[PDB]
């Protein structure tokens with residue numbers, strides 16, 4: 001994930017309350033900047049929310065009063081914030097503050113060169129087992145790009161049609177089969193079945209192991225586990241359950257399209273395998289800007305009386321996929 005990249009200043013607009021600052025559009029994001037830091041069309045380094053930036057008075061003095069400890073080192077975590085009434089996200093700095101990047105090009109990922117890293121909520125301790133092996137290379141990891149970083153693609157996909165589903169807030173979990181072996185994995189490892197492992201227990205109680213055996217194909221069930229003991233259980237659940245959102249065809253190396261997934265989950269439940277699916281909302285004919293898509297992010301969740309974290313969109317061909325995280329949710333939750 002490109003936590004710090006080189007980007008272009010979009011349109012700049014005043015903020016009436018405090019004229020020492022102004023509102024700057026970096027592609028889909030809005031920043032508060034110092035007035036006269038950028039004119040539109042200038043390049044700079046933009047750090048995304050969740051960046052953790054080590055303490056530097058020369059380079060990041062504007063971060064000096066939100067310094068925290070994190071996993072041993074001292075630095076600043078970027079979150080959604082409301083600065084003098086203006087909702088602002090990330091940090092945009094001009095290039096004359098980065099001499100060692102003087103001849104980098106727009107679009108470059110300078111995460112590693114600046115030592116940026118990602119602040120992460122601590123381990124949910126009921127969800128970490130013993131590791132049989134790494135995540136299998138013949139399976140794609142579950143990762144969604146943010147719509148604020150895709151404005152060119154949204155204009156390209158004008159006219160395309162997308163499946164819209166609720167984005168649950170839980171940890172990712174993969175159950176798969178390759179020919180005589182059925183494995184359970186979290187985000188980055190394949191785990192051994194214990195009387196401990198939350199993922200194995202989710203897999204066994206909805207029987208997706210015999211289900212995958214039954215279906216007799218090299219498929220990867222990918223879902224979020226959510227519920228008790230998981231990210232504050234904002235969905236008011238009893239227990240923990242598996243909610244699917246993608247199926248990776250291992251042999252063809254590509255995800256199932258929505259209707260294929262939809263009919264395969266149907267096939268699974270028909271034969272008595274209790275695989276739940278992330279909530280599907282009605283499909284979308286993309287004719288939108290990033291702002292309008294974000295504007296759909298707020299709304300009812302799996303529990304219809306709680307505000308969802310956001311939405312994810314899947315182009316029906318199955319090859320284009322992005323999320324749009326609710327900013328109201330991000331503001332009503334700082335961790």
Ligand SMILES: Nc1ncnc2c1ncn2[C@@H]1O[C@H](COP(=O)(O)OP(=O)(O)OP(=O)(O)O)[C@@H](O)[C@H]1O
Nearest residue numbers: 142143144165166167168171172223224245278312
């Ligand atoms: N409806 C959904 N469709 C796809 N993924 C979903 C859905 N609901 C929840 N998820 C979760 O979304 C996550 C994948 O998105 P993402 O790549 O943003 O996660 P991340 O790598 O943990 O976060 P980030 O990279 O943005 O810091 C997975 O952890 C998966 O469990």
Ligand SMILES: [Mn+2]
Nearest residue numbers: 001142143144
């Ligand atoms: Mn990711």
